[PDB]
Amino acid sequence: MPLSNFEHKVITECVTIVLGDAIQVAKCYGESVLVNAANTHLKHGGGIAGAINAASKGAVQKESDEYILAKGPLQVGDSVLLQGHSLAKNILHVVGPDARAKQDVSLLSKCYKAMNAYPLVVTPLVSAGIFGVKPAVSFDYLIREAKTRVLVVVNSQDVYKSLTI
Numbered sequence: 594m595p596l597s598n599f600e601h602k603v604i605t606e607c608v609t610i611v612l613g614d615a616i617q618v619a620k621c622y623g624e625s626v627l628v629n630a631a632n633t634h635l636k637h638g639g640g641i642a643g644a645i646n647a648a649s650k651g652a653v654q655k656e657s658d659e660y661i662l663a664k665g666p667l668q669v670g671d672s673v674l675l676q677g678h679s680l681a682k683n684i685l686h687v688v689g690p691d692a693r694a695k696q697d698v699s700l701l702s703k704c705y706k707a708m709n710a711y712p713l714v715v716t717p718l719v720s721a722g723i724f725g726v727k728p729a730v731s732f733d734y735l736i737r738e739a740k741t742r743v744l745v746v747v748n749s750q751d752v753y754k755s756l757t758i
């Protein structure tokens with residue numbers, strides 16, 4: 594039982610909240626799709642994006658640079674399915690809105706709808722770090738959209754406590 598390794602709370606038959614590292618959660622599930630909380634240029638310099646890139650030994654960034662050079666930058670709310678690099682079956686790069694730039698927070702709906710294409714998704718709370726969206730607000734957008742099995746992973750115990758009462 595992969596989740597026995599982690600404190601967690603089942604919210605619905607779709608959505609479970611997990612305390613830990615989303616990369617280590619996804620490693621337990623060979624058929625999971627791991628969500629990267631990315632920016633429009635897929636520049637994975639810090640945050641969960643930097644951690645995912647480091648776990649891939651830089652391979653994620655090389656793949657992202659090829660994609661962006663070929664396709665041009667993404668829009669806020671866009672998502673792109675790329676290779677998993679042995680971290681997960683695939684990695685879904687999702688561009689959440691940046692509240693610092695007063696971008697439309699409701700674009701999180703579009704971000705989370707994109708996860709419904711996959712039978713099992715491991716995701717952080719998109720935009721919930723430096724992009725300035727409060728975790729409970731990002732969770733609100735997630736639970737409204739999720740139609741598949743989603744493990745929502747938070748690496749702060751204070752965030753986990755606040756989300757589980």
Ligand SMILES: Nc1ncnc2c1ncn2[C@@H]1O[C@H](COP(=O)(O)O)[C@@H](O)[C@H]1O
Pocket residue numbers: 613614615616630631639640641642644717718719720721722723724746747748
């Ligand atoms: N490995 C991780 N696993 C789960 N959550 C993370 C991880 N790294 C960062 N976070 C949090 O997930 C949210 C989105 O990450 P970020 O896009 O980097 O702001 C923020 O609340 C981060 O603090």
